[PDB]
Amino acid sequence: NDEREYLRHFWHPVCTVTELEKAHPSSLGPLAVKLLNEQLVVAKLGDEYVAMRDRCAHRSAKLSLGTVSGNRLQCPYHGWQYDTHGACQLVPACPNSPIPNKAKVDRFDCEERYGLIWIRLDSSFDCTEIPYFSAANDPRLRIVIQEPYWWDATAERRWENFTDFSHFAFIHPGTLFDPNNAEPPIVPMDRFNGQFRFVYDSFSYTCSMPFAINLEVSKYSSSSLHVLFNVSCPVDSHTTKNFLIFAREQSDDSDYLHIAFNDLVFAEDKPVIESQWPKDAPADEVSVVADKVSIQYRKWLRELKEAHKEGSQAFRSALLDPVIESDRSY
Amino acid sequence: NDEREYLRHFWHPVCTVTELEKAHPSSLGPLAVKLLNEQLVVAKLGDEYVAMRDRCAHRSAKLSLGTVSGNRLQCPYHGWQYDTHGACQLVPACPNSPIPNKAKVDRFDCEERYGLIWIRLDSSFDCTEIPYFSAANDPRLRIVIQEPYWWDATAERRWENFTDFSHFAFIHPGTLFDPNNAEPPIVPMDRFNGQFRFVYDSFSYTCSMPFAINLEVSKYSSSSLHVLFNVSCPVDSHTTKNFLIFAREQSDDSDYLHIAFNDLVFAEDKPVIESQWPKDAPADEVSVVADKVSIQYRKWLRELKEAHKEGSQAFRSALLDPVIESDRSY
Amino acid sequence: NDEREYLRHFWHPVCTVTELEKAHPSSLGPLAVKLLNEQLVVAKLGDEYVAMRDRCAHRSAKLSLGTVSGNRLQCPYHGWQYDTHGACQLVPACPNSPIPNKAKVDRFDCEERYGLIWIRLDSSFDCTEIPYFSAANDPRLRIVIQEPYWWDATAERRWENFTDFSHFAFIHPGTLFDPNNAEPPIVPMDRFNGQFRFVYDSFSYTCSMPFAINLEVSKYSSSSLHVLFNVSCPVDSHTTKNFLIFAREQSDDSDYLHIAFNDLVFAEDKPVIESQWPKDAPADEVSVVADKVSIQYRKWLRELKEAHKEGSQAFRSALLDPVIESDRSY
Amino acid sequence: NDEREYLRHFWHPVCTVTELEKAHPSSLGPLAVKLLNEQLVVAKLGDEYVAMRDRCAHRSAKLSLGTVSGNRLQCPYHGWQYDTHGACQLVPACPNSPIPNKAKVDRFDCEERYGLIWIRLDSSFDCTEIPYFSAANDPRLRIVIQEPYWWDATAERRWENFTDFSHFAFIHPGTLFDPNNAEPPIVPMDRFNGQFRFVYDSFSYTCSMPFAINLEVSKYSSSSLHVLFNVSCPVDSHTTKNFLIFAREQSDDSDYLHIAFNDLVFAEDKPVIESQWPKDAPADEVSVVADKVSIQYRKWLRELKEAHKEGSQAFRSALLDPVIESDRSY
Amino acid sequence: NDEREYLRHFWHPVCTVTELEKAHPSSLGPLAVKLLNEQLVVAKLGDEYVAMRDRCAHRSAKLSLGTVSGNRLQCPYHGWQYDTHGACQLVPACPNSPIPNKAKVDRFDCEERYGLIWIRLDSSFDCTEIPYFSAANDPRLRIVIQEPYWWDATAERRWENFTDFSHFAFIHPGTLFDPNNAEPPIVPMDRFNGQFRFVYDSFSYTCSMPFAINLEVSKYSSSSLHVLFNVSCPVDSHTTKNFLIFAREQSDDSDYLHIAFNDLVFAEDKPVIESQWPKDAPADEVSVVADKVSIQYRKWLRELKEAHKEGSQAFRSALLDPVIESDRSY
Amino acid sequence: NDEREYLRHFWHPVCTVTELEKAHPSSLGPLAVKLLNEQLVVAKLGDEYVAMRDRCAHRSAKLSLGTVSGNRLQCPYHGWQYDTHGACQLVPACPNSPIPNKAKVDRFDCEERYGLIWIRLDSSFDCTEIPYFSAANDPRLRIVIQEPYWWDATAERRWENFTDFSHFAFIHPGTLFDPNNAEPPIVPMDRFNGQFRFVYDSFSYTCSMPFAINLEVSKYSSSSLHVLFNVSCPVDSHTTKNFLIFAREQSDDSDYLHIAFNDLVFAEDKPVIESQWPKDAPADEVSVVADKVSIQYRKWLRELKEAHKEGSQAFRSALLDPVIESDRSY
Ligand code: FES
Ligand code: FES
Ligand code: FES
Ligand code: FES
Ligand code: FES
Ligand code: FES
Ligand SMILES: [Fe+3]
Ligand SMILES: [Fe+3]
Ligand SMILES: [Fe+3]
Ligand SMILES: [Fe+3]
Ligand SMILES: [Fe+3]
Ligand SMILES: [Fe+3]
């Protein structure tokens, strides 16, 4: 718990826009979501996506069992109506009395981007941004947002799985493995603008810390751009709700050709990653040199955790200071 | 936790007589029941309903898997037989040896009333009685005992739901909400003989503390008496087993007209009440003036809990001293 | 928790050889097993059955999801290969670097006997042996290994059920209760070589402490030998995986006549034993003279628990010193 | 198919009044029922129970999915309203046009008696009555109507099972088999008023043809009257919906003592009777002298089948002519 | 069967393009579908959508269990490869022998349009076209293809339900009914170009015979165009697979607002339509004047059925001859 | 239908001996089985396995719900006892009366062989014998009888699947397909003693007509003998109960290595074979030269079916006359 408090300062995806619209016949929510073990409710009130604690101030019913009408989220129990700022603006039982100052629920940063809904629980450091997806607003590329997928594994373990190449021959032998490319090198890794940047051989990674990966592939078999954008919502201490968006230049083929392939890859990873125990990586794990990405990831996470304890300035420097290993200029 | 110790001093219903008779083909029980997280067993031993701890003194098997033999409860494992006082009177393997002095299980005050079985776990204060049901022994009324219904909510939250009128428009708009009588005002509430008494003008409540509600309705659409008796068994920290008995003066219609209607009402309340979290109301809940019944209820429970810590005489005064604010003469 | 640590010094069955061979198409395992709440993996590497902690040293994946490859157990994630001593001998991603000294997993004693796989978690006292089954090596007898049966009950409670005669009239009245022979006397019990030995007149028990029972019956209905070997794996604090092997001299009949009878007896015991609570017998249980076997059993277990605290030679003495009550010579 | 047409002339129970009142929240129905493979709908219109073909004349929707509205059954599709004679009296889409003469559905005899709803599909022979239940109107007796029980067996096979004593030692050895009274003799059987009447010494049968059995027991264990009334609804060619009403003079005990016993007896019979094949008894079945009751039953049924072909007065004579074997006077 | 043969001459939708692409990871099919009780397989071979009988010529395995590679559908059993014309072009067991002339399966007209796959089983009359959807290629309108929905009702009964207004007050009271528009008139109906054309008050219907409905609504509440395109696949004698495509001018709102509404309407219709029995409308159904659309629909279907028996010219005239009742010119 | 009458003249396996012993706790049966749509019962009566029609002569209950008593099969309903010839020898209700002459049920030739129970429904031609299994009574071979496996396919289609090599690349590419030995040629096939005999160079088939296959493999990868014996029970027109027995010379490996492999092979075949439709091969199937085994099999079955219509001597010649085309000397 206290060991995860620094994560409240980042933007995390909690649902797709589609999920929010499908939740109830109004198409406006509400939708219950869970983020860092906090129970939240999401709704569209007018033009705004709003996120509140899923707990009415009156008698603690779940607002996610209520109703969106226009610019209000109405509690299902005694009909208190909450506005976009989390403030109750109608107590139907006392329509002429003034509403208690108490009658407000916590309201959090909530924004749509790339077709996902993002929530930032703590905006006090004012230095984190929604992760970078390189294919957004590139009109050469067709974009597909997959349905979210749930794993009984943590966001850290999911991230390390996605950025590891050592596992292809054993988890993905028929699907991703390459006899003639069967142990890619140790590569230089740069920190720039709160992202890890590193390239392989052609795979170009931009990883917005802590849990998002933007992978641009310049493909060998077709010579056309493919982008994978994967981000894990840390739902609680043992669970992730994971999102994949993918973009492609050659878009004459079926979206489901790629969805089925992505789903096959995830199905091969899933049971092995869910088997890792304890859920959080303990100190006794044994790294080797080929674990560079994982080793550097864990080091930066540890530094961000320390810097959060020191405060806004220290956190901003730990996240945003550049640290360059490569020949590249940014 | 220790919050609930004072509740052990009250009589709580644990099952209907019908449930006890259906439990075992003999119609005498035994039946396993749970009350304030205690595992108990109820059986008809001779002319008496008896409650014991559901745990044999010999090797801890559940007596509820056993059988009533004569006027005794026989354990299923090695056949020890327990009398109405929880004392072992036969050890089949050693029929002539003396029975160990410790060969006994705790028993508890247990009585049938109104077709329910009631248990009081702690009788040491000796000032509580079985709640009041006004329709009992009224020849003019047909009485129907419904099957128990289980909620994932506490008895306090269930009580507050049953006595609140604010929620009709939102939970019961098609079934109970009167669009010409939305808000009855604050009414005076009296404490008398360990009951809350209050009237609307016609709904007359007599609420035997802590969890029983007797509601006499002098109906408007029929000019005839209807009585609802609702009481919650606090099974554990997050569960209630709830009992509804209803009585009616005009009794030539179908029982199932009313049962179906009550069931529909409970089905409307249930998911909202079960969503309330945390399960016990914290101090941060925000009341409005329309919540008088709930406010006064919580106040009295707090007083009973503090008086229990001060001992038998303090508790008896907190429970039984009158506090009148209406002009009714009792 | 610490009350059970002394049980780690004994050999416990964890699966049948059949279960191991059925686990994976290779017939070599791996198979996940759980013993005293430890997650272990069993595999056949060459001619050896091996047992390791089910947790890779690299990134903590379960080895039980991996593959046997010759004399090695290969992790499913990045293919680290472990030898019969639990030491990693191949890191495929770094195939010529020195393997970290840390790259080892805990390896436990593991042996086949009687068609079961046995594990001893702690071999430090070097004085325990796999329990004795008298029918092994006897060409006169046909041996049948039943499928394991799981109970929600501890190994101590299961052992006391199997060696008690008092319960027949109440649990097994149609099946084992002899109405003309309804109370076998208290018999002398010998401790010899870490076994309880006692005889009823014809039932000869050799009970390898703590959880195995070898029962030799010279039957009253055939003049033929029948052996029952029952042993309970203590899977965790509330669960047993139980094994029955039986042997018989007159073997021209169907194995399933006997299997169905054993299963019927176990089904009659099961719900009563599973109801016993709390799972471990508290000090408050009330014994009678007929309970001699379980009284003496509990005494010896407590002696073994005390001696374990005192260290290796106290434990050896408590386990293996003779204590003779009968007129028999050993 | 045509072999069963004569059964349409009798009254058959189709549901309990309780089932009808529970079907729909209004307590008035409608309820879908099936009798001799006809799909019917039952409803309470005013003070009358009505039974119609469950098929609207307009577009063939099921009226059982509709609503009772005063003295009318309203179709769910376009709201045509049917009166107690099955005639449409309102076409909402054409509220002042003349209603087509075709706008009528078949209406069948429907009456409540003993707490069951009875239907007679063909009243043309005007000689059948609702079966006789002797305990009705008797203030000395407490009456209990059990929930209906469904069997995969025909009404004839169920009737022959209920009136056979030969099967007790094999189906009911623990439950009804009297080892000292193991073969009741052949008894004289009288036909009187469309009933078989026969007596065993104390068991007095009055069997209203074809499917109802009234059994009056003067018990050997109390000197008290016990009545069993069993009747089978022939739902289709292989299914029965069966009804048991029982009455007892000594009524201070639990209803559920008796219900559980009846249910245990029925559960013992059920799989054997359901196994009988083909469902209707072929001519090749081999009778013995002990089968007198079922031999005479089969003879009378065949007589009724022959007489139905001959028309109304032959059937009346076959049903109601007396045929006396005993010394009794009627 | 013979009574449905005329339907083989029309184009019927059998799946969405999305369903075909999702069926297997190739994204090319194959997909099993059923049309007029014929088992068919659909695949994308190169650029073409192809439909064949789902039955290999060799040993009658289902081609729908096989694999699409490029321009071939490979049988799962012995790998015979079929081309876009249904001809086997590779017998892997006899790669040098010539392929039997027998080695071909029936191939049917198969075309994508509007995002659905359409099949015409009989092209011999050469005068039927894929039904008309007015919103196709109108760039003012956003188009949404719903997931198909299955009903246990025939295409005729589904069509008549969709074009009836009489049922709103009873099936759709809260969702479509209008007190102040509560019985729309009898309207003129034109036959033109194989479509029924009729308008209401503003609802404009173009119904391509036999099973498609294109409804253009000029809405009262928003003054913007909404188009509903509903077509029923006659899967067999009692089943429809139904498709809804809808288009809207005001497309700033959520697609799921409309999907949820359409799904609610269908859920209200579904149980009533599925209750209609027999599945095909028999002669005894009673029409009233307000049934004009249904009456005229059944008349044209009957004429098409007669004309099919007479041949191509007669069928073409029955389908395509104009029959004008309205003031309109086409 | 009448197509299958000739199959009644052959011996078919109906269950394993293990299945019979497991059916009832006595280990003697009875066990219900179905063969060519006949409902039969098998029991061990004394030293004999007996098959009767599963239908009591008295009131048609299933004898398979009864019990073996001594050397008789006792009906569950009224306890009639049937001897090994199907004759009733005890009528409990009339123990002294003469037993009706018709109190008997049909019995059928029934024998154990190889650990299976075989039944021949029609013994009148008296020229068929139980199929040949070459490994029986060979000391060098360990024999494993697998559990039966059920397919929704006919015995003919299952036989043709088992003897076809064409399908390996497509159904079994990972498990059986040899990429260097795809096509063995047409081989000569001999008819001898009612068996098909044919050899590949090493696979030697002896196929006892109609449904049994004995395959002797002189393996290449081990230089040791492996025998597969597969036989299908034609349960009804669309179902088979299939039996696999396998024998091996090198028998120090795990039985479950082989069982798992066989099960994987059957799992690969099963959905393709079950998809073949219609269930019986019609005349429109297209054979190629590689189908010789299947072509010759169907030819011989057609001859047996025609010879059966001509009578006992014609059938005996069709079945037993030799037809040699190899140069082997028998
Ligand atoms: S709990 Fe939300 S309005 Fe009362
Ligand atoms: S545990 Fe109850 S008698 Fe032994
Ligand atoms: S977790 Fe085992 S090899 Fe990496
Ligand atoms: S189908 Fe009943 S009113 Fe139309
Ligand atoms: S059944 Fe299709 S290739 Fe043989
Ligand atoms: S039916 Fe078998 S003994 Fe009566
Ligand atoms: Fe992966
Ligand atoms: Fe309520
Ligand atoms: Fe036991
Ligand atoms: Fe019976
Ligand atoms: Fe509709
Ligand atoms: Fe195969």
Side-chain angles (χ1 to χ4, degrees), chain B residues 13-313:
Chain B
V14 292
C15 65
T16 63
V17 173
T18 292
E19 284 179 304
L20 175 59
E21 293 176 7
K22 289 172 45 84
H24 185 283
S26 73
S27 78
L28 307 173
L31 172 74
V33 301
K34 182 187 272 189
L35 170 61
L36 296 163
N37 213 41
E38 301 259 30
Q39 302 184 81
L40 311 171
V41 55
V42 173
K44 182 135 191 278
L45 304 184
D47 291 301
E48 189 175 341
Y49 296 102
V50 173
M52 303 176 201
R53 197 175 306 282
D54 191 12
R55 179 179 178 253
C56 184
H58 180 220
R59 293 294 188 256
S60 306
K62 289 191 176 68
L63 300 175
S64 58
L65 299 185
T67 64
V68 173
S69 181
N71 294 0
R72 299 186 185 153
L73 180 53
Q74 174 172 301
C75 179
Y77 199 173
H78 317 82
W80 289 20
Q81 300 187 343
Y82 294 89
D83 67 18
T84 61
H85 281 277
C88 179
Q89 300 296 344
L90 175 67
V91 170
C94 314
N96 302 317
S97 310
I99 296 179
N101 180 66
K102 285 294 183 179
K104 54 179 188 282
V105 306
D106 294 338
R107 55 108 267 163
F108 306 91
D109 281 17
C110 178
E111 304 281 341
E112 180 276 323
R113 200 167 293 173
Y114 320 128
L116 310 185
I117 302 301
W118 306 78
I119 292 177
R120 174 173 67 190
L121 287 168
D122 192 325
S123 299
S124 66
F125 286 1
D126 204 31
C127 62
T128 56
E129 291 190 70
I130 292 172
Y132 167 76
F133 177 30
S134 65
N137 310 315
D138 186 338
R140 307 174 307 178
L141 303 177
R142 179 181 173 81
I143 293 174
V144 173
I145 306 171
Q146 299 204 183
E147 278 164 23
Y149 61 99
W150 293 76
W151 281 8
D152 191 58
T154 61
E156 293 86 348
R157 296 238 198 234
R158 204 275 163 282
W159 190 100
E160 296 184 19
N161 172 241
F162 201 95
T163 57
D164 166 73
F165 286 126
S166 285
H167 74 276
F168 285 8
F170 308 97
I171 295 183
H172 308 300
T175 57
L176 291 173
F177 164 68
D178 191 19
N180 289 102
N181 179 26
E183 265 69 38
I186 309 83
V187 286
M189 303 171 70
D190 305 326
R191 308 184 187 181
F192 186 71
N193 291 344
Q195 312 165 343
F196 252 144
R197 306 201 187 188
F198 46 98
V199 184
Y200 302 87
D201 294 290
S202 173
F203 283 28
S204 176
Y205 293 76
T206 308
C207 308
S208 303
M209 297 287 290
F211 299 137
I213 298 160
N214 185 91
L215 167 62
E216 297 174 85
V217 179
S218 311
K219 283 174 66 184
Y220 298 158
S221 78
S222 56
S223 278
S224 68
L225 183 57
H226 203 104
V227 184
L228 309 163
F229 177 76
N230 194 266
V231 56
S232 301
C233 180
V235 168
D236 58 31
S237 69
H238 51 97
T239 305
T240 41
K241 181 181 179 179
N242 302 286
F243 302 89
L244 178 70
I245 308 181
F246 67 95
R248 67 194 197 273
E249 189 175 40
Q250 303 187 330
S251 55
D252 289 304
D253 54 6
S254 171
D255 287 347
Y256 298 98
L257 175 66
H258 304 277
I259 293 163
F261 181 81
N262 296 332
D263 288 349
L264 173 57
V265 169
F266 293 157
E268 293 177 331
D269 284 308
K270 174 183 184 288
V272 181
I273 302 324
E274 293 186 326
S275 83
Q276 292 178 275
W277 69 282
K279 289 300 189 196
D280 300 312
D284 66 350
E285 285 185 353
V286 179
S287 299
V288 292
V289 170
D291 295 323
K292 178 181 190 182
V293 173
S294 156
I295 294 158
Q296 295 307 313
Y297 178 67
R298 291 168 180 199
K299 181 179 174 181
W300 199 356
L301 293 180
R302 190 171 57 246
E303 293 177 19
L304 292 164
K305 173 167 111 177
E306 281 312 291
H308 168 262
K309 275 148 59 180
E310 281 141 50
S312 175
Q313 184 30 257

Side-chain angles (χ1 to χ4, degrees), chain C residues 18 21-22 25-27 254 256-257, chain F residues 18 21-22 25-27 254 256-257:
Chain C
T18 295
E21 295 177 359
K22 289 176 91 174
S26 67
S27 77
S254 169
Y256 295 103
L257 174 66
Chain F
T18 292
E21 293 176 7
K22 289 172 45 84
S26 73
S27 78
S254 171
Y256 298 98
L257 175 66

Side-chain angles (χ1 to χ4, degrees), chain F residues 59-294:
Chain F
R59 293 294 188 256
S60 306
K62 289 191 176 68
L63 300 175
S64 58
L65 299 185
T67 64
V68 173
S69 181
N71 294 0
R72 299 186 185 153
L73 180 53
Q74 174 172 301
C75 179
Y77 199 173
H78 317 82
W80 289 20
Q81 300 187 343
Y82 294 89
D83 67 18
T84 61
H85 281 277
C88 179
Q89 300 296 344
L90 175 67
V91 170
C94 314
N96 302 317
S97 310
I99 296 179
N101 180 66
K102 285 294 183 179
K104 54 179 188 282
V105 306
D106 294 338
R107 55 108 267 163
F108 306 91
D109 281 17
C110 178
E111 304 281 341
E112 180 276 323
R113 200 167 293 173
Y114 320 128
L116 310 185
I117 302 301
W118 306 78
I119 292 177
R120 174 173 67 190
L121 287 168
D122 192 325
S123 299
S124 66
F125 286 1
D126 204 31
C127 62
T128 56
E129 291 190 70
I130 292 172
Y132 167 76
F133 177 30
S134 65
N137 310 315
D138 186 338
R140 307 174 307 178
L141 303 177
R142 179 181 173 81
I143 293 174
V144 173
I145 306 171
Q146 299 204 183
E147 278 164 23
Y149 61 99
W150 293 76
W151 281 8
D152 191 58
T154 61
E156 293 86 348
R157 296 238 198 234
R158 204 275 163 282
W159 190 100
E160 296 184 19
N161 172 241
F162 201 95
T163 57
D164 166 73
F165 286 126
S166 285
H167 74 276
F168 285 8
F170 308 97
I171 295 183
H172 308 300
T175 57
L176 291 173
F177 164 68
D178 191 19
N180 289 102
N181 179 26
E183 265 69 38
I186 309 83
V187 286
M189 303 171 70
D190 305 326
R191 308 184 187 181
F192 186 71
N193 291 344
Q195 312 165 343
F196 252 144
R197 306 201 187 188
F198 46 98
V199 184
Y200 302 87
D201 294 290
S202 173
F203 283 28
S204 176
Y205 293 76
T206 308
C207 308
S208 303
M209 297 287 290
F211 299 137
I213 298 160
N214 185 91
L215 167 62
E216 297 174 85
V217 179
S218 311
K219 283 174 66 184
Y220 298 158
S221 78
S222 56
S223 278
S224 68
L225 183 57
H226 203 104
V227 184
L228 309 163
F229 177 76
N230 194 266
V231 56
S232 301
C233 180
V235 168
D236 58 31
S237 69
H238 51 97
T239 305
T240 41
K241 181 181 179 179
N242 302 286
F243 302 89
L244 178 70
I245 308 181
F246 67 95
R248 66 194 197 273
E249 189 175 40
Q250 303 187 330
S251 55
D252 289 304
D253 54 6
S254 171
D255 287 347
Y256 298 98
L257 175 66
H258 304 277
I259 293 163
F261 181 81
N262 296 332
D263 288 349
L264 173 57
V265 169
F266 293 157
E268 293 177 331
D269 284 308
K270 174 183 184 288
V272 181
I273 302 324
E274 293 186 326
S275 83
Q276 292 178 275
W277 69 282
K279 289 300 189 196
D280 300 312
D284 66 350
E285 285 185 353
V286 179
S287 299
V288 292
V289 170
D291 295 323
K292 178 181 190 182
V293 173
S294 156

Side-chain angles (χ1 to χ4, degrees), chain A residues 18 21-22 24-27 44 147 252-257 260-261, chain E residues 18 21-22 24-27 44 147 252-257 260-261:
Chain A
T18 296
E21 291 179 12
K22 283 172 69 57
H24 295 287
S26 68
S27 77
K44 194 174 178 178
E147 295 190 284
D252 211 31
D253 55 3
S254 169
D255 294 335
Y256 296 100
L257 174 74
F261 182 79
Chain E
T18 297
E21 291 179 12
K22 283 172 69 57
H24 295 287
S26 68
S27 77
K44 194 174 178 178
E147 295 190 284
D252 211 31
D253 55 3
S254 169
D255 294 335
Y256 296 100
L257 174 74
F261 182 79

